[PDB]
Design an enzyme around this catalytic site. Structure first.
Site, PDB file in Angstrom:
ATOM      1  N   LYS A  79       4.085  -0.161   5.304  1.00 10.57           N
ATOM      2  CA  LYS A  79       3.808   1.075   4.572  1.00 10.57           C
ATOM      3  C   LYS A  79       2.368   1.006   4.065  1.00 10.57           C
ATOM      4  O   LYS A  79       1.940  -0.020   3.548  1.00 10.57           O
ATOM      5  CB  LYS A  79       4.779   1.223   3.395  1.00 10.57           C
ATOM      6  CG  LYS A  79       4.653   2.545   2.656  1.00 10.57           C
ATOM      7  CD  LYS A  79       5.809   2.774   1.700  1.00 10.57           C
ATOM      8  CE  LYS A  79       5.705   4.139   1.045  1.00 10.57           C
ATOM      9  NZ  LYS A  79       6.885   4.461   0.200  1.00 10.57           N
ATOM     10  N   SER A 154       9.668   8.103  -0.057  1.00 12.64           N
ATOM     11  CA  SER A 154       8.283   8.209   0.391  1.00 12.64           C
ATOM     12  C   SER A 154       7.919   7.374   1.617  1.00 12.64           C
ATOM     13  O   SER A 154       6.890   7.622   2.255  1.00 12.64           O
ATOM     14  CB  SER A 154       7.364   7.810  -0.755  1.00 12.64           C
ATOM     15  OG  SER A 154       7.675   6.503  -1.194  1.00 12.64           O
ATOM     16  N   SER A 178      12.570   5.606  -2.339  1.00  8.79           N
ATOM     17  CA  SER A 178      11.559   5.740  -1.292  1.00  8.79           C
ATOM     18  C   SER A 178      11.768   4.837  -0.073  1.00  8.79           C
ATOM     19  O   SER A 178      10.979   4.879   0.868  1.00  8.79           O
ATOM     20  CB  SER A 178      10.166   5.493  -1.885  1.00  8.79           C
ATOM     21  OG  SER A 178       9.825   6.471  -2.860  1.00  8.79           O
TER      22      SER A 178
END
Ligand SMILES: [Mn+2]
Ligand SMILES: [Mn+2]
Lengths: 485, 99, 399
Positions: A79, A154, A178
């Protein structure tokens, strides 16, 4: 693009048995990315050159029969809110476009040590704020199971890249779901370890007390393996827990008969969709047929999850992001002539609508005259939400229920509706507030869109979660489907 | 309810976020909606409940006072868009109109 | 008419190897931004790591300050945007400051007055922003250096009581060996809050915060000037208001640089990145014992025992080294009074005139001990001591 669908476990052995050269394992990956991401759009910065170099190094090590590392020659996606040395980390925000970290985050440190190969960075919501990754300043990732649908927020990029067979494992960050929510939407295995299980040194902060890094894989087993390679205390993270036992694979494969599973009635409340509810109910049945004992219980304060979560998260966010002024790094407004402008112009021009909304809320929740009425209050509510769990855990081993109230939603459906966008964190936020470990595995499909099943365990009881998670997985999963898309 | 232009601009100032009067109004409502959204917590009985600052029950995590040479000046300025003489160059005209 | 209320916000630089929340060295060279790292630079993803010694020392100086040491103490964030504070927030302590409710006795034109020190918490020093041209150069070298804030109860009542306060404080901290406490070096800084309230009523006049007080002698200058400044205001007419004032070293007057619109909002809240502290007895003892005989009890020991005067006991207990030197040379063989008079002046006046403040790497107790006896009953008297002293001090050891 051949081993692009193999699990971390198999692919791991395929390399040990010299049935495949690390360099080609990578050749495949990028071949995959080149063909699939143009449509998925889950990857941001690509570290191909370095990747190729490492694999070349590995081939040698392969021949020399010196293959060390829990994830030797295993392709990995990270990420973009997790710092990677020398690799452009932008947190999917204008504010940090072009930013090149000068230090290595602790998880990447550990991963490299286990000889994993860094293929690239995954797309995400701007600064982990969002539930559909649509807030990304670079691109909108899509749900491999339905390109008309969102990946989740997210860490949408992490869940999509794994589901789209671009990588065997990837990392994400969970502050309010997330990791689990994007997991549920893309129908892959997501895991937010207990707060303190995985170092935060190197993680661009959003909510210091809720943030946490976790793995995303295509199956329960691989997910455990990865969490072993990243867990462990760290002197660079004072909150990192001094828990040595980081083996999570040991109790996998064992039955769950007699396992006491608590089904919060509030988790099948009014905010939950009908199809999602059905899926989980049949799941409950499956958990019974496996021997586990499932009985209803109450997590009363659940309804206060989302509200308190935002106040808290936003507040902290209104503090963790304040370091972004374009002075030592990041976006530096050019139209600034005064010192006040430099701050107010770099910040405004660099952050997106949603990030500024959190900041405004947060900054407000803390400001004089409102602090007690919002922040303090939320903190007290958080205490309630944990007690709920505390009480429940007095008689139950784990908790179960849906991960997301509904299947993945349409792109642009709620992008302009922050309030409804929020409602989606109904079932996730409680865990981060309680700091417990949660995990989501697919348990159904409605119109092709996957449904998530979550398992909430006791602090540092991830091994049990994997135990029950693997069992259920045996009765259901999407292992055979990713391959078809 | 009741979120004046004033407050809106006071927070923006408290956050170093430039906001035009054409964004103010808009933000006044949004905040209000979010606040009304936040108001939900008030229906939770927190009488005599201690706030949760940390979820993990750790204690005394200290670091031995032993220095570690810092990074080169170059490294510290490598990502700064504005620098002069080995430092971060920034405006500073103190006029209650720009500040 | 009026009792002038004033308090002093004092910061002290603990001299530790590494910084407060970063392993960076607390001492730096001349090259700007060379003594830093990702933490000090507030790079995204960095976290604070508490300096253990910084705490021990912090609570060592807090005890010597007659405060109650907290059992549970956690840090909080002080949020404010400023070029030398990169995180946009300073890790400090709001509630639960490591030390609370202390005091120190002082002697002012009259007798003993016990002023109370409300609190003592730990902070991290900021960087230094040099003003060049219409721009500004920033140097985070100093950023992150461990500090301890000491707020006085608003008890001190005069520009002199303030001086007496800083000295006794500076003095006591100096003895704990936790800081060189020099204002001319920045290892001891002081801010003063002053406001007047005419007797009879509870209301106050204007209240100002004095900034740029850089020396013991300077705080008094501004303080007593300010005192007279708002003294007129209160009488002449004066418009009550909360303000901040900068003291001009040259002119000797304070300049109004801003009028408070209210109470600065720092949105204080518990630092989640740093797990709470739980100072237990054993710990409190470890640091309890590590405290010597502070100036007061050290002076009272110079009163009856070794019956020495008053002026004497004050200047000899001014610093620990000075005092230790004196007692180290007293046993050697130097007659009580002899050295006392020899230290009070002569040596003190030599140090001041030569700036040889390093009373240690120069003449020593072993060395000085002799000169005393040589005069005491050996060779003749005084005058020969005129030059034999300076030589004997700057080098050599006896002859
Ligand atoms: Mn301070
Ligand atoms: Mn001050």
């Amino acid at each position: 693009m051949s081993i692009r669908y193999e699990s971390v476990e198999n692919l791991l052995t395929l390399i040990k048995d010299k049935k495949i050269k690390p360099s080609d394992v990578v050749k495949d990956i990028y071949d995959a990315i080149e063909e699939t991401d143009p449509t998925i759009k889950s990857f941001l910065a690509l570290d191909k050159e370095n990747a190729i170099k490492k694999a070349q190094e590995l081939d040698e090590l392969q021949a020399k029969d010196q293959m060390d590392g829990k994830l030797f020659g295993i392709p990995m996606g990270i990420k973009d809110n997790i710092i990677t040395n020398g690799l452009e980390t932008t947190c999917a925000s204008k504010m940090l476009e072009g930013f090149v970290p000068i230090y290595e985050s602790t998880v990447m440190e550990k991963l490299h040590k286990e000889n994993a190969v860094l293929i690239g960075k995954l797309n995400m919501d701007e600064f982990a704020m969002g539930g559909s990754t649509e807030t990304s300043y670079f691109k909108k990732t899509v749900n491999p199971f339905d390109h008309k649908a969102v990946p989740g927020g997210s860490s949408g990029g992490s869940a999509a890249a794994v589901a789209a067979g671009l990588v065997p494992l990837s990392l994400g960050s969970d502050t309010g779901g997330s990791i689990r929510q994007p997991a549920a939407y893309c129908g892959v295995v997501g895991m937010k370890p207990t707060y303190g299980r995985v170092s935060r040194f190197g993680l661009v902060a959003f909510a210091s007390s809720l943030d946490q890094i976790g793995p995303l894989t295509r199956n329960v087993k691989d997910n455990a393996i990865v969490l072993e390679a990243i867990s462990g205390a760290d002197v660079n993270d004072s909150t990192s827990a001094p828990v040595d036992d980081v083996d999570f694979t040991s109790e996998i494969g064992k039955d769950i008969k007699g396992l006491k599973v608590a089904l919060p009635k509030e988790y099948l409340g009014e905010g939950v969709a009908d199809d999602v509810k059905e899926a989980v109910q049949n799941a409950v049945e499956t958990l019974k047929s496996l021997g586990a004992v499932v009985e209803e219980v109450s997590l009363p304060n659940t309804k206060f999850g989302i509200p308190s979560y935002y106040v808290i998260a936003s507040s902290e966010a209104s503090s963790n992001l304040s370091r972004f002024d374009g002075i030592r790094y990041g976006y530096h407004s050019k139209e600034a002539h005064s010192l006040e402008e430099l701050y107010k112009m770099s910040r405004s021009e660099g952050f997106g609508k949603e990030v500024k909304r959190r900041i405004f809320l947060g900054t407000f929740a803390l400001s004089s005259g409102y602090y007690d009425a919002y922040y303090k209050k939320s903190q007290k509510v958080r205490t309630l939400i944990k007690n709920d769990f505390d009480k429940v855990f007095e008689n139950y081993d784990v908790v179960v229920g849906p991960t997301a109230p509904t299947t993945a939603f349409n792109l642009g459906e709620e992008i302009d509706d922050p309030l409804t966008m929020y409602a989606n964190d109904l079932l996730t936020t409680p865990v981060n507030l309680a700091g417990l470990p949660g995990i989501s595995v697919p348990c159904g499909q409605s119109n092709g869109r996957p449904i998530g099943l979550q398992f909430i365990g006791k602090p540092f009881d991830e091994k049990t979660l994997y135990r029950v998670a693997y069992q259920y997985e045996t009765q259901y999963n999407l292992h055979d489907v990713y391959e078809k898309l | 309810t009741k979120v004046t232009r004033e407050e809106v601009e006071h927070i923006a100032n408290l956050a170093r976020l430039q906001i035009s009067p054409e964004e103010t109004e808009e933000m006044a409502n949004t905040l209000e909606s979010i606040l009304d959204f936040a108001k939900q917590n008030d229906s939770a009985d927190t009488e005599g409940v201690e706030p949760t600052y940390h979820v993990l029950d750790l204690q005394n995590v200290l670091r031995e006072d032993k220095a570690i040479k810092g990074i080169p000046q170059e490294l510290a300025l490598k990502n700064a868009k504005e620098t002069e003489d080995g430092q971060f160059k920034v405006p500073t005209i103190m006029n209650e109109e720009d500040a | 008419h009026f009792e002038t209320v004033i308090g002093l916000e004092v910061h002290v630089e603990l001299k530790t190897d590494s910084k407060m929340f970063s392993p960076s060295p607390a001492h730096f060279g001349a090259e700007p931004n060379s003594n830093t790292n990702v933490i000090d630079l507030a790079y995204p993803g960095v976290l604070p790591v508490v300096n253990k010694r910084a705490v021990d020392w912090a609570m060592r100086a807090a005890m010597a300050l007659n405060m109650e040491i907290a059992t549970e103490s956690k840090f909080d964030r002080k949020n404010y945007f400023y070029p030398d504070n990169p995180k946009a927030y300073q890790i400090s302590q709001f509630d639960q400051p490591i030390g609370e409710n202390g005091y120190i006795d002082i002697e002012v034109d009259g007798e003993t007055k016990r002023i109370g020190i409300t609190r003592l918490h730990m902070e991290e020093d900021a960087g230094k922003s040099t003003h060049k041209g219409e721009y500004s150069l920033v140097d985070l070298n100093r950023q992150g250096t461990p500090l301890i804030e000491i707020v006085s109860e608003p008890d001190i009542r005069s520009p002199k009581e303030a001086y007496a306060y800083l000295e006794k404080l500076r003095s006591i901290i100096q003895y704990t060996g936790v800081s060189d406490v020099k204002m001319e070096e920045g290892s001891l800084r002081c801010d003063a809050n002053i406001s007047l309230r005419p007797y009879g009523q509870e209301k106050f006049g204007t209240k100002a915060e004095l900034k740029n007080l850089n020396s013991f002698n300077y705080v008094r200058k501004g303080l007593e000037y300010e005192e007279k400044r708002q003294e007129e205001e209160l009488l002449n007419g004066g418009e009550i208001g909360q303000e901040t004032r900068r003291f001009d070293e040259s002119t000797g007057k304070t300049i109004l640089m801003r009028v408070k619109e209210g109470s600065d909002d720092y949105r204080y809240f518990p630092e989640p990145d740093i797990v709470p502290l739980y100072i237990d007895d054993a710990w409190k003892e470890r640091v309890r014992q590590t405290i010597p005989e502070l100036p007061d009890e050290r002076k009272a020991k110079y009163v009856n025992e070794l019956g020495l005067p008053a002026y004497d006991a004050h200047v000899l207990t001014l610093t620990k080294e000075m005092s230790d030197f004196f007692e180290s040379t007293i046993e050697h063989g130097a007659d009580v009074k002899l050295t006392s008079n020899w230290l009070m002046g002569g040596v003190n006046e030599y140090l001041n005139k030569n700036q040889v403040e390093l009373l240690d790497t120069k003449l020593t107790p072993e060395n000085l001990a002799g000169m005393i006896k040589l005069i005491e009953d050996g060779t003749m008297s005084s005058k020969i001591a005129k030059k034999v002293f300076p030589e004997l001090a700057a080098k050599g050891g006896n002859a």
